[PDB]
Every structure is written in C-alpha cells, then in structure tokens.
Amino acid sequence: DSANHLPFFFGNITREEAEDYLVQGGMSDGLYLLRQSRNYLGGFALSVAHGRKAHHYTIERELNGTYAIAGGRTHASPADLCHYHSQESDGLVCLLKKPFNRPQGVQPKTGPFEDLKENLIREYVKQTWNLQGQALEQAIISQKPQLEKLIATTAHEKMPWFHGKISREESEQIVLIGSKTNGKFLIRARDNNGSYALCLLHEGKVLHYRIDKDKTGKLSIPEGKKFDTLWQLVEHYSYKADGLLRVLTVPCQKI
C-alpha cells in the first residue's frame, strides 16, 4: 500500500509511541505523523502536536475505498488527507505544518498479522485454486486486492493463540500445561457467532474475559476498546494491560 512510501508513516506504532516521537521532534504546533490504525481495518491514525498536547484522529477506509476522519470530506489516500489539512484546518485542531519523519533506516512497524499476511494469501490461493508454478503466481497477483479483507477477517484461525471451539475447562487444561508464565494466553470461540473468550494466566490462575461482536460487527471485552479483528485485539493487549489484570505475553501453543 502507498502509505509505506510516506517518510512520516510509522506503521503499526501505538499512540504512546506516536506521542514519544512527537516529543522527540520538539512537539511544535502542527508537527504530525501518520500511523496504521490498530483497531480499524484498512484505517490510519493522524497524530498532531498543538498547545504542547497530542491530538489523535482515526482515518477510516470508507466502503468505496476512500479515506475520512469522522465528520470530514473523503480523500483518495491518507497522503491526500494530510496534504489537504496542510492548506485548510477544516475542523482539525490546527494546520498540519511539518511532518515528523521516521529517522533514516527505521522502518514502519508491522505486527504479527502483517508479517504473516503474504503467506496467508499464498496458502489460501494454493488451497482454493489448486494451481502451481507461474499460473499460481498470476492468480495470487490477480486476486490479492480482492482477498485482502477476507484474509484479514479469517487470519486469526491460522495464528498460534487461536484454539477454535474448545470449552472453558479444555482452555484451563491447555494453559496450565508447562511453564506458568504470567500473561500466557489463548482465545477460544464460544458460539461461532462472533463470541469468544480471552484466557489469560495470572499468578497460576486462568482468567476468562468475554469478547462479543456488537451490531456494527466490532469485537470488544465489555466497556473495552473496539476492534474489527481478533488479531488487532491481541496486538493491543500484548502492548498494554488496558484493564486486563496484566499484558498478554506468550501464546499458548495448540496441543
């Protein structure tokens, strides 16, 4: 995607990391960077310094493939949105004055999903199309953009922490095998209805947090941050407890 070519795109960094970068850059009015949304699929976040405070905007990908902040006009790309807001404030806290660029040789951050994504597309096309050699390579190239959203919404099935439809009791048994590492975790399906449980090891005891799909199709622990995908939810709670008794550490391997 074209936002990797932007010098001020930091990839999958957290809000806190974005704020750390803005302070490193002087926290000057209209200093800004771009990052990948950690809870909106296909989305970005704009992080802007003004009045020595950080202001964070989600840039959502619309159904039609344009990009908009809530209450804003649509743009062809995050780059076009940033260029636009360098000319007109149009409800933003201030004008975008100066990009904060990644220091040279520092790459955009990728999560586990981002690192696996090409292999998941390849495996899916091999399995559905049953092609080999150049014919397989062409089918991959042709279908990649059509398949991105399908692979993003089903990629959790192929991730080491996802154990599918197992009981509460089975999930306790699997987590309590081996080293009782704090933060050891898995996710299980409850309903095959968009209902799941996060099973987390805390001081030798297995805690169960419910995950539900709301009417928008967003996943959350009740009163928690909302995500489009389970892999987003795991990446989030692997960085910060954010209301869990502790941060997620080692995935419980399937047995």
Binding site: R15, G71, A197, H208, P222, G224, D242, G243, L245
Partner: peptide, 17 residues
Amino acid sequence: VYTGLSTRNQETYETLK
C-alpha cells in the same frame, strides 16, 4: 465466572464533527 476490565476505555479520538 468472567473477569471484567478494571477500567473503561478512556482515550478519546478527536473528530472533524
């Protein structure tokens, strides 16, 4: 028994509304 979050999500995003 399900455990609940020890805090509601409290970070705001700004909008252009």
